[PDB]
Amino acid sequence: RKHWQERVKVHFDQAGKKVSRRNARATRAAKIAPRPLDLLRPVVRAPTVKYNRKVRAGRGFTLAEVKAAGLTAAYARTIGIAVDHRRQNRNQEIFDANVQRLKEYQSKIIVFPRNGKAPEAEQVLSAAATFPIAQP
Amino acid sequence: SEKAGHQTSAESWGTGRAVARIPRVGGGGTGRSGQGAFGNMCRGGRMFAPTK
Amino acid sequence: GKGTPSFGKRHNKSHTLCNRCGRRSFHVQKKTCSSCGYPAAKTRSYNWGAKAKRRHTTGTGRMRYLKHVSRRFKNGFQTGSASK
């Protein structure tokens, strides 16, 4: 057969890579504080007849969902909302769920002024943990 | 090392030469020339089934 | 007569000293070094000649300039002088 011995991948560095990933997460959190390490992701329905019984996290909120929530795409991107321009809305229940998520996020975040004294607060590292995906 | 015992230019001298048919170092002018090579029974050769 | 008597007629030189690598490998009639490839711009080397690459590679000589590059990088390519 082929010369397989010249291409053997052994993962001796599994623990080292885990340590490096945790260090990278801590470094990025310190550099980015106090905003979280992740953007707000919408709830979408999984494709195909095998997985369409579940909902999961999509890439970003649609322009229609952002406009219904009352924001612009640029401002939502600046305040930490993932926006996807190619996903389309054809499901009223999903549309309402995403609008509700955006409104709850806006209620639960605090945006610091561009000029002036900052109200100091501890950073929460996971928007996904703060706003979990729930199966309806 | 995967290259241990294999960084040698040696070839067998053939059958009927009044010496063993192990590959032997070519060239000349040094004590290395004519010595056995590549075998697990040879000094400086490769071990049997090298560890991986 | 192809052995010992024929060995007595050897008094010429196929190769002389090469200006680039200093070996006795500059073929006189071809005006080309069989070791480094002079006078071609590139230095001769082959992937089947791993031992030759090791013999002639970087670090076998003095590295007159390249030795200090690591120290200068570590200090950040600084300019000026220590102000006591």
Partner: protein, 119 residues
């Protein structure tokens, strides 16, 4: 023993030139004596004194040339910064930080806001 650089640096060009010539004469005399006495430790300090005088002279000349070329667009290449070849060929800070007017307007209008998930 030998000469000291900080004592040399307080002198003029002609004094340094005369000192260098005297040191060269002394070196010639020591090399004459070395033919009879193989161990002559003074040769080392005379050689180092010659090297130090040359170093100070070159320092003064190069500083004068730097002052002459101060505040000019084009400098001698041995007075320019060394760095590395790639570092010299790289873009400057101004060129790297250049932006288009459209991008500048976008950056002014919508910068990365500072926020936290607390309330």
């Amino acid at each position: 023993a030998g000469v000291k650089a900080y004592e040399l640096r307080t002198k003029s060009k002609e004094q340094l030139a005369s000192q260098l010539v005297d040191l060269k004469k002394e070196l010639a005399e020591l090399k004459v004596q070395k033919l009879s006495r193989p161990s002559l430790p003074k040769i080392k300090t005379v050689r180092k004194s010659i090297a130090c005088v040359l170093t100070v002279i070159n320092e003064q000349q190069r500083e004068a040339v730097r002052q002459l070329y101060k505040g000019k667009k084009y400098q001698p290449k041995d007075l320019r910064a060394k760095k590395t070849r790639a570092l010299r060929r790289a873009l400057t800070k101004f060129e790297a930080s250049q932006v288009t007017e459209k991008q500048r307007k976008k950056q002014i209008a919508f910068p990365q806001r500072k926020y936290a998930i607390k309330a």
